[PDB]
Amino acid sequence: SNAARDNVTKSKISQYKDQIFDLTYPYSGNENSSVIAVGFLDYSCGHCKAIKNDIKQLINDGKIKYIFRDAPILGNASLKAAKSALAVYFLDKEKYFDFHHAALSHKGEFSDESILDIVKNIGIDEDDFNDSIKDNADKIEQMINNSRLLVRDLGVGGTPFLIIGDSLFVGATDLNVLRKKVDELS
């Protein structure tokens, strides 16, 4: 696009800053970094799957806080995988990225079983996992609804997209562009 439209994006990010940088959502990287990235993903989306290592590398660079917004819009399978991801988060936050990355690595469509195969491979017990789904159902539901509305409010109209600082990157953004913006802001 161009300057005028980027300026509007900056104003919207300020308007929704409490929502975008909400602290109750899962994050990796430096908790205390002022350079905060906020990623919006559907696990069944082809472009979301393909940037999984861009995300991993950008996080491992060490410079940012990266918040994960699970924004399922591609159907029942995505909602399941999204719900399951947060069900892991609330059991053990250190395992959320592992579910995240495995879900993105999961090439075919999700099924109840394949999601459990993932919960098993990352060290979580089926019964702890089932109790998490049920016990935290209201809060998971609330978090996903709030992310969907945020995606609507930002008007992007699909996934993936990534907010860093006052900028919004749409689609499979090259890693070098993200890194330059992060450095500029550091």
Residue numbers in the entry: 63 to 248
Verbatim from the authors:
The introduction, isomerization and reduction of protein disulfide bonds in bacteria are controlled by disulfide-bond-forming (DSB) proteins. wMel strain encodes two DsbA-like proteins, α-DsbA1 and α-DsbA2, and the integral membrane protein α-DsbB. In contrast, α-DsbA2, which is highly conserved in Wolbachia, does not interact with α-DsbB and has a long N-terminal region compared with α-DsbA1. Our results show that FL α-DsbA2 is a strong protein disulfide isomerase and that the removal of the N-terminal residues eliminates this activity but gives rise to weak dithiol oxidase activity.
We used two constructs: (i) FL α-DsbA2, the full-length mature α-DsbA2 (lacking the signal peptide that directs the protein to the periplasm) comprising residues 16–252, and (ii) α-DsbA2ΔN, a truncated form of α-DsbA2 (lacking both the signal sequence and the 50-residue N-terminal region) comprising residues 65–252. We were unable to generate crystals of full-length mature α-DsbA2. The crystal structure of truncated α-DsbA2ΔN reveals a classic monomeric DsbA-like architecture. Using SAXS data, the molecular mass of truncated α-DsbA2ΔN was estimated to be ∼23 kDa from I(0) and the Porod volume, which is very close to the expected mass for an α-DsbA2ΔN monomer (21 kDa) and is consistent with the crystal structure that we report here. We next assessed the protein disulfide isomerase activity of FL α-DsbA2 and α-DsbA2ΔN by following the reactivation of scrambled RNase A in an in vitro assay. By comparison, truncated α-DsbA2ΔN recovered just 35 ± 3% of the RNase A activity relative to native refolded RNase A over this period, similar to that reported for the oxidase enzyme EcDsbA. Therefore, we conclude that α-DsbA2 is a protein disulfide isomerase and that its disulfide isomerase activity requires the presence of the N-terminal residues. Notably, there is a basic region near the catalytic site of both PmScsC and EcDsbC that is absent in α-DsbA2. A hydrophobic region is also present in PmScsC and EcDsbC, and the conservation of this feature suggests this is a binding site for unfolded protein substrates.
